[PDB]
Amino acid sequence: SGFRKMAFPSGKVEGCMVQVTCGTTTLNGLWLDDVVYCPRHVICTSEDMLNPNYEDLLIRKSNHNFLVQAGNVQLRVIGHSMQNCVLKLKVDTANPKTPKYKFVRIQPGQTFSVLACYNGSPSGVYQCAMRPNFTIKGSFLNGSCGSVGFNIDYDCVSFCYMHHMELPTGVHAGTDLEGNFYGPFVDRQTAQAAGTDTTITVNVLAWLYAAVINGDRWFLNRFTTTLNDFNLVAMKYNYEPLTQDHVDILGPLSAQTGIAVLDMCASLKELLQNGMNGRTILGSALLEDEFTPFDVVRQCSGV
Amino acid sequence: SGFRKMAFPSGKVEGCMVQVTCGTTTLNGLWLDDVVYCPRHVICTSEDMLNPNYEDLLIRKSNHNFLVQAGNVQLRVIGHSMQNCVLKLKVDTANPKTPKYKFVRIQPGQTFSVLACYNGSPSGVYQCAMRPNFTIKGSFLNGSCGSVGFNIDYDCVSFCYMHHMELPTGVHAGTDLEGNFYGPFVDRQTAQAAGTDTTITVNVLAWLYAAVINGDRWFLNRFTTTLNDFNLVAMKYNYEPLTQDHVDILGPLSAQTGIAVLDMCASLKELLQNGMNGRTILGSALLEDEFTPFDVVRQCSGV
Ligand SMILES: *[C@](O)(C(=O)NC1CC1)[C@H](C[C@@H]1CCNC1=O)NC(=O)[C@H](CC(C)C)N1C[C@@H](NC(=O)OCc2ccccc2)CC1=O
Ligand SMILES: *[C@](O)(C(=O)NC1CC1)[C@H](C[C@@H]1CCNC1=O)NC(=O)[C@H](CC(C)C)N1C[C@@H](NC(=O)OCc2ccccc2)CC1=O
């Protein structure tokens, strides 16, 4: 019992974090096998960052201009290339702590663990969702660029995020490990705005199931609805439209609780229209959308 | 920018978690040097748990009745003793992954990271406070007993909590690593109730400073107050009384923001009396008390 925002254990990722320095700029890199991954803006001077030509800035850079440091030890850079918005530095030593891993580009609404790092050293770990507007609600200071997001499947680390930037609303944007931004963001110091911050409906439903599993059922009402009827109300509150695929994903939680998804949708509809009347659900006063159905099942079944 | 509930990186603690089995009961233990620590109720049958005599139950137990398993490997138990509500199992192998560590009994209002474990394997990591009523708001299932809470000071792990039980309100209770419960709880299957859940005032103040640091200052009003005036309102809302020691601890955040602690107390007073008017502070609709002043400074300064 109880329900918390829970990160993956970070040990396997801690052993991959290094410091990368190019001139005066020090950020985080990810050391897997004989390659270090880091944001390409490590090569920028404070003036370059205004409107950089990365191709031109790389003409000026050689292997020896990248200092890679793994705790107290200097790694030897024997190659470098740019892939989209990431630099890949080939080093002469395979990381002996390299876990089983893969690179994934995550879908909007999916969650991952962030290991916030400074100067190649772990600060802390917390869970984030890739929001529909391709931003995340993180906690990142100067020095955090190159911090990574990940999931763990038993022993395999799925790396899905590399931290690059902060946006006006105090939210964050970054790339997959192939250097492609989530969203329409670019790695330059120009004003960029997040689009409408739509709510992940299927995750709100999942969290309401979690509330029922933990004995909090005050908000279950006597109504049901239809997908089309619910979605008319969703669009009004900038909720993602619910589809049969979403209903299917909530199936195991519906089965566990004996509450049909469309009955839970009806309860969600009345919470949207009437608010919580100063009551709380799993210790929250607002509707939480950063738990996936899998996060709920995992937590409630001890995976 | 941004502000999140952040756990310590868990790698150094992951390497200490083992499975302990006594008969049909399997729980978590903590392997440091040549000693495994676990809850003494590992020795209880499902009937024993109703009113156990632990001293008598231990007459029946020998070294060979404790199965300790570290991943795939069986450790050899060469000694056992009970210290308060914990068992200490002496094994013939020092844990080679033992970090620098200490055992601390934490004060009410202080925070720590929990590594939730099942069958000796890490499930996830999240931050908790030791509440004034000596309970924590965790996420624990059957199998989680022996999961530990900790802080990290640079390289040194301070272990402060071992998980034993759940309470009616869906909150949790456990011991320090010397086997002494936080609070008046006992390790037996009898109905136990948490006392009044008082709010950690100094931590709410800290979180309001965090809000100001992150540009959220809508709730700063034109008033100041006195310790005694504030405390009259505190006691009404079951807040901890504020003392000069609390003011001194908030000093660095006051200095950082240029908001005198007693001005922030006046803002807190009006939030208690008037509520948030459906507004939010750092993405929350209620007053958060599980961040210490140190948690705020650490997060806002990249420690
Ligand atoms: C990382 O580059 C970083 O940590 N660098 C290490 C060397 C110190 C940094 C992380 C940010 C900084 C604060 N919190 C974070 O997450 N990222 C940047 O500074 C971004 C640099 C670009 C990728 C080149 N960056 C640029 C900045 N953009 C900006 O100022 O645009 C103009 C603007 C005008 C008005 C209002 C707002 C913005 C945001 C950003 O993160
Ligand atoms: C741990 O013992 C555990 O994980 N054991 C491993 C072998 C499976 C367990 C953890 C709990 C279980 C669910 N979530 C948790 O955190 N702890 C217990 O089961 C406690 C056992 C005692 C320490 C011996 N325990 C006893 C139970 N008490 C109880 O039922 O009292 C009567 C009551 C009456 C009415 C209403 C409520 C309670 C609570 C508890 O955690």
3-state secondary structure string across A155-197: CEEEEEEEEEEEECCCEEEEECCCCCECCCCCCCCCCCCCCCC
Alpha helices (H) in chain B, listed in sequence order: 11-14, 54-59, 201-213, 227-236, 244-257, 261-274, 293-301
**Neighbour count for residue B81 (Cβ, 10 Å):** 11
**Neighbour count for residue B220 (Cβ, 10 Å):** 17
Q: Indicate the burial class of B142 (C-beta count within 10 angstroms; 0-12, 13-18, 19 or more).
A: exposed
For residue B39, report the distance from its CA to the centre of ligand 2, in Å.
Answer: 12
- Determined by which method? X-ray
Ligand nearest to the CA of B168: 2
Q: B189 CB under 6 A from ligand 2?
A: yes
- Considering only the beta carbons, identify the residue of B124, B143, B303 that sits closest to A8: B124
According to DSSP, the residues that pair with B76 across neighbouring strands are none
Most A CBs within 10 Å: which of B115, B125, B216, B218, as the mutation test of the A interface?
B125
For residue B51, give the H/E element and its range.
Answer: none
Query: Using an 8 Å Cβ cutoff, are B159 and B30 in contact?
Result: yes
Question: What would the two tokens of residue A247 be?
Answer: 């209903």
Size (chain B), residues:
303
Question: What would the two tokens of residue A2 be?
Answer: 């109880």
Q: Indicate the burial class of A226 (C-beta count within 10 angstroms; 0-12, 13-18, 19 or more).
A: exposed
Rg, C-alpha atoms of chain A = 22
| 3-state secondary structure (DSSP) of residue A17 | strand
Query: Using an 8 Å Cβ cutoff, are A32 and A12 in contact?
Result: no
Nearest to A161 by CA among A104, A122, A116, A90: A104
Q: B165 CB under 6 A from ligand 2?
A: yes
Q: Please report, to the nearest 10 degrees, the dihedral formed by the alpha carbons of residues A201, A206, A211, A217 taken in order.
A: 70
Instruction: For a ligand 1 pocket test, name from A20, A85, A142 the mutation site with the most ligand atoms within 8 angstroms of its C-beta.
Output: A142
Strand duo B100-103 + B111-118: pairing: unpaired
Nearest to B137 by CA among B157, B179, B167: B167
Contact across the interface for B278 and A275, Cβ inside 8 Å = yes
Instruction: Kindly list the strands in the beta sheet with B86-91, ordered across the sheet, starting from the edge strand earlier in the chain.
Output: B73-75, B67-70, B17-22, B25-32, B35-39, B86-91, B77-83
For residue B149, report the distance from its CA to the centre of ligand 2, in Å.
Answer: 18
Contact across the interface for A140 and B15, Cβ inside 8 Å = no
- Residues in chain A closer than 8 A to B139 (CB atoms): 1-4, 6, 299
- Compute the Cα dihedral for B110, B111, B116, B121 and give only its sign: negative
Give, in order, the Cα–Cα distances in Å from B93 to each of A164, B82, B102, B140. 45, 20, 20, 30
Q: B173 CB under 6 A from ligand 2?
A: no
Q: Name residues contacting ligand 1 (CB within 6 A).
A: A 25, 27, 41, 49, 140-145, 164-166, 168, 172, 187-191; B 1
H helix and E strand count, chain A: 7, 13
Domains B11-91 and B201-301 agree in fold: no
Strand duo B156-167 + B100-103: pairing: parallel
Residue indicated by tokens 């209620």? B286
| 3-state secondary structure (DSSP) of residue A241 | coil
**Neighbour count for residue B107 (Cβ, 10 Å):** 9
Query: Using an 8 Å Cβ cutoff, are B30 and B19 in contact?
Result: no
Cα A222 from Cα B150, distance rounded (Å): 45
Contact across the interface for A125 and B10, Cβ inside 8 Å = yes
Cα A130 from Cα A202, distance rounded (Å): 14
Whether residue A64 lies in the annotated active site? no
Residue B76 DSSP code:
P
Would you give the distance in Å from CA B279 to the centre of its chain? 29
What CATH superfamily is the domain B11-91? Trypsin-like serine proteases (2.40.10.10)
Question: What would the two tokens of residue B228 be?
Answer: 């005694």
Q: Please report, to the nearest 10 degrees, the dihedral formed by the alpha carbons of residues B265, B270, B276, B277 taken in order.
A: -160
What CATH superfamily is the domain B201-301? main proteinase (3clpro) structure, domain 3 (1.10.1840.10)
Nearest to B164 by CA among B300, B289, B49: B49
Nearest to B78 by CA among B66, B67, B92: B92
